[PDB]
Amino acid sequence: LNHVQNMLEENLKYDAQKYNDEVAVIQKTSRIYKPTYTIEFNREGEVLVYSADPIKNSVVYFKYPYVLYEAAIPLFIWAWIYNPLELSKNAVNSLLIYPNIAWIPRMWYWRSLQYKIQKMYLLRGGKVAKIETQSLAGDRFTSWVETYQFHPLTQDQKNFDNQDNAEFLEDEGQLKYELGVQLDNLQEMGTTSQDIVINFMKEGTVHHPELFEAIVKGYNIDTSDYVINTANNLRAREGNHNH
C-alpha cells in the first residue's frame, strides 16, 4: 500500500512528524495577569470567584418543548388502544414507538442542567480552577481545569468571543449576561472529554471580578501577594439550596 504515492498522504505524514518533533509538552506563554489587590485565600489555599444555584434558578418540570413532547404521548396511546385509523397489527403497534422515545430530550436537558457551575475556586499559583457542580439527583461533581483551556463565547453562544477584549462583566463587576465558556479538555469523573461547554448564569454572585475575568480569558494569575484566612466555616458534603 505504501508503494502507492500520494502527495496529500505525504503532506499529512510530514505534518504529523513535524508536529511531533517540534511541539513539546512544555509550551511557553506570556499571558500573565497581576491583580492589583492582594488575594485572600481560604484555609484550603483557594479563593472563591463565582457562586450560584442554577438548579434553584432554572426551570426543571414545565420546560418547553419537552412539555409538548411528553403531552403528545397520550394521543399515541389512545390511537393504539382504539385503532381509530383501522390499521393492521404491525401498523398499530408502530404507534407505541413514540412513548419509548418522547422523554429522551427532557433527560438530555436535565443532564445539561448539571453543567451550570455552582461554584468556582482559583488555586494557588493562578493556574488551576476548581469547578463544583451538582445534578438534580444530588450528585456533586468537582473538576479541576487548567486556566489556559478556557475559551469564552459571544453573548449569542454561536461564536468564540475575543479573549483579549471580552465584554461580559458589568461596570461594578457582575455578569452582564449568562456567560458561556468552552473548555478544550475537561476531566470529569476521571474521564477526559473534548470541547465541554459550561455556563455561568447571570443570576449568580461574582467574587473577585478581576480573577473571574482572568480565568475566563485564560490568563495565568500571579498570586505572589497572597494572604491566608483560617476559617473552617465549610463542612464536608455541606448542604445548600442548589437542590
Ligand X SMILES: CCCCCCCCCCCCCCCCCC(=O)OC[C@H](COP(=O)([O-])OCC(O)COP(=O)([O-])OC[C@@H](COC(=O)CCCCCCCCCCCCCCCCC)OC(=O)CCCCCCCCCCCCCCCCC)OC(=O)CCCCCCCCCCCCCCCCC
Question: Nearer Cβ to ligand X, position 48 or 92?
Answer: 92
Q: How many Cα atoms within 13 Å fall on the side-chain side of residue 76?
A: 16
CA–CA dist 106, 121 (Å, integer): 30
CA–CA dist 104, 123 (Å, integer): 38
> Could you say which of another protein, ligand X, none residue 104 binds, taking C-beta under 5 to 8 angstroms by partner kind?
ligand X
Least distance between another protein and beta carbon 161 (Å): 12
Per CB under 6 A, 160 contacts ligand X? no
Per CB under 6 A, 97 contacts ligand X? yes
Per CB under 6 A, 14 contacts ligand X? no
Our CA dihedral for 166, 169, 170, 174, rounded to 10 degrees, sits at 180
Least distance between another protein and beta carbon 94 (Å): 18
Cell 450528585 sits on residue: 139
Residue 21 in 3-state DSSP? helix
Per CB under 6 A, 71 contacts ligand X? no
**Pick from 59, 60, 104, 231: which binds ligand X (CB under 6 A)?**
104
**Pick from 1, 2, 3, 8: which binds another protein (CB under 8 A)?**
8
Question: Nearer Cβ to another protein, position 37 or 82?
Answer: 37
CA–CA dist 198, 112 (Å, integer): 9
